[PDB]
Amino acid sequence: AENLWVTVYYGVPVWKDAETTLFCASDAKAYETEKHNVWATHACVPTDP
Amino acid sequence: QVQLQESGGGSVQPGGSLRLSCAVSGLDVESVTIGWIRQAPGKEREEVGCISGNFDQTYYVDSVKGRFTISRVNEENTVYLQMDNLKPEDTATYYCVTDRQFYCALHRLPVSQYRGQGTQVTVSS
């Protein structure tokens, strides 16, 4: 009450503004009938339905 | 999925020219071999010829030489078989087969994974 003590918490919901390098994710389509689109979808991981 | 579709054929009087075509989808015909085989009524599947992927060399069985010609067009993905001076022995059903192999051997063409429906050729009278 009259006295307080410091306490450390890990895993708190706080964020800041920053920048990074996002990665691609495209629809799978099994990549079978695609006639080699210039925006090739075989170069990045498929997405989650 | 590899798909092969044939076109041409029919009935032709003895002596003349015919042209059959085979279109391939699901592949690019530059690094695989393409063979043409025939089946006559009452006999097993013999084999007519093939075009390989090694420097675009073509091979034919001893029965047909100087009469048949196999050509390939890669910008259209098509294989043409041009036959000249047809004879009564040629009445049969023709198929275009492939095996995704960058080499040809003229005794393993009848036993191939993929095969088209085929066209029919008659010469009579």
UniProtKB/TrEMBL annotation, chain A:
Highly glycosylated by host. The high number of glycan on the protein is reffered to as 'glycan shield' because it contributes to hide protein sequence from adaptive immune system. Disulfide bonds join 24-44. It is found in: Host cell membrane; Host endosome membrane; Virion membrane. The CD4-binding region is targeted by the antibody b12. The 17 amino acids long immunosuppressive region is present in many retroviral envelope proteins. Synthetic peptides derived from this relatively conserved sequence inhibit immune function in vitro and in vivo. HIV-1 lineages are divided in three main groups, M (for Major), O (for Outlier), and N (for New, or Non-M, Non-O). The vast majority of strains found worldwide belong to the group M. Group O seems to be endemic to and largely confined to Cameroon and neighboring countries in West Central Africa, where these viruses represent a small minority of HIV-1 strains. The group N is represented by a limited number of isolates from Cameroonian persons. The group M is further subdivided in 9 clades or subtypes (A to D, F to H, J and K). Envelope glycoprotein gp160: Oligomerizes in the host endoplasmic reticulum into predominantly trimers. In a second time, gp160 transits in the host Golgi, where glycosylation is completed. The precursor is then proteolytically cleaved in the trans-Golgi and thereby activated by cellular furin or furin-like proteases to produce gp120 and gp41. Transmembrane protein gp41: Acts as a class I viral fusion protein. Under the current model, the protein has at least 3 conformational states: pre-fusion native state, pre-hairpin intermediate state, and post-fusion hairpin state. During fusion of viral and target intracellular membranes, the coiled coil regions (heptad repeats) assume a trimer-of-hairpins structure, positioning the fusion peptide in close proximity to the C-terminal region of the ectodomain. The formation of this structure appears to drive apposition and subsequent fusion of viral and target cell membranes. The mature envelope protein (Env) consists of a homotrimer of non-covalently associated gp120-gp41 heterodimers. The resulting complex protrudes from the virus surface as a spike. There seems to be as few as 10 spikes on the average virion. Surface protein gp120 interacts with host CD4, CCR5 and CXCR4. Gp120 also interacts with the C-type lectins CD209/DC-SIGN and CLEC4M/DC-SIGNR (collectively referred to as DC-SIGN(R)). Gp120 and gp41 interact with GalCer. Belongs to the HIV-1 env protein family. This is Envelope glycoprotein gp160.
